[PDB]
Each structure stands twice: as C-alpha cells, then as structure tokens.
Design a binder for this molecule. Structure first.
Ligand code: APR
Length: 165
C-alpha cells in the first residue's frame, strides 16, 4: 500500500488524477474497489479496465461467483481475487441512477469500504451509473472511515471535484 501523489481531502480520504489500473500496478494494494453491477458483468468503466488488466481472469471468476451465488444486491459487495492488480478486489454495486435506482443506496454502497483498513477505489455510480460525481465524493467522505485512496481518471472531473470540495 505505497500510495504516492495523492491530495489529502480529509483525515481518511485522499484523491489523485490517475487511472485506477495504473495505480493498482504501481501500488499493489491490499484491496482495489470495482464499481460493479449486480451481475458482475464488467462494462465500459472501471470494471472493464480492471478486467482487461487481468487478461479476463476477473470476468471468468465473476461469472463463476454469480452462477453459484446469484446477483448481488444494489448497495452490496463481494470480495474476490485481485489477480495481478491487488490481493483482493472488492466489487461494490452503487445505484444505477440512470435506470431509476435510489441514489440513497450510495451510502450503503460506500459502507462496504469500512470492512477494509485501506482501499484503492473509484467514485461509485459517478460514471456509467449516472450519479453526480460531486455528490458521490460527499457520500464517500461522510460514510467511509477507513483509509480510501480515490483514483479519478478524467482530469476535468478531478479538477471540479477538488475545486468544489
Ligand atoms: N480507469 C479509470 N480509472 C479511474 N477512474 C475511472 C476510470 N474509468 C472510469 N473512471 C471514473 O470512475 C467513476 C466510476 O465510473 P464507472 O466505472 O462507470 O462506474 P459506475 O458509474 O458505478 O457504473 C458501473 C457500471 O459501469 C460498468 O463499468 C460496470 O460494469 C457497471 O455496469 C467515474 O467518476 C468515472 O469517470
């Protein structure tokens, strides 16, 4: 967990303008967080970038998990292998606001972070799921008490997050 280049937002929340995949390769963290859907079908955001960097090992593992356990609940999580990127991957499902799911479930989603002392993580629901990224950062800051290192790839979004925080 050797995190460098992060801006301190609060006592336990840090942020960097970086690709979460490149951070995982540099830091080799204990836990990397995936912004997942309930079926762990890894799509066009963080999930697909993580999966591609595991040369699809993550998706094969995820498919087997889902065949046994069924879908996650919105706001829920599961711990699977981090493969070559981390010791563990915490797959967390934020609400899909674009499909009408309750934004209030973003609190429950971030509560999953508290089971791990330190995490490399993205802003949940703030991309393909359509939540306000500024709001997602606020919920993270208010909800997570363990040490979270947030990686935000889009510099325009990063600058707006830091400015309004
Ligand atoms: N490689 C990346 N590194 C860092 N941040 C990233 C990266 N790619 C996207 N982001 C940012 O991470 C945040 C989360 O975006 P998404 O990954 O799209 O996550 P979410 O909004 O929760 O959507 C989940 C959905 O997207 C699919 O990838 C996934 O399978 C699920 O269906 C957003 O702020 C987005 O700009």
């Amino acid at each position: 967990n050797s995190f460098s280049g992060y801006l301190k937002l609060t006592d336990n929340v840090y942020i960097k303008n970086a690709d979460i995949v490149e951070e995982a390769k540099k830091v080799k963290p204990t836990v990397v967080v995936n912004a997942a859907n309930v079926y762990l079908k890894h799509g066009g955001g963080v999930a697909g970038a993580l999966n591609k960097a595991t040369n699809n090992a993550m998706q094969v593992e995820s498919d087997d998990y889902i065949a046994t356990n069924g879908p996650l609940k919105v706001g829920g999580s599961c711990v699977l292998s981090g493969h070559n990127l981390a010791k563990h991957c915490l797959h967390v499902v934020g609400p899909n606001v674009n499909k009408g799911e309750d934004i209030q479930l973003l609190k429950s989603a971030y509560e999953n972070f508290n089971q791990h002392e330190v995490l490399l993580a993205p802003l949940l629901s703030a991309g393909i799921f359509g939540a306000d990224p500024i709001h997602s950062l606020r919920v993270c800051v208010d909800t997570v008490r363990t040490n979270v290192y947030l990686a935000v790839f889009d510099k325009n979004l990063y600058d707006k997050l830091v400015s309004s925080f």
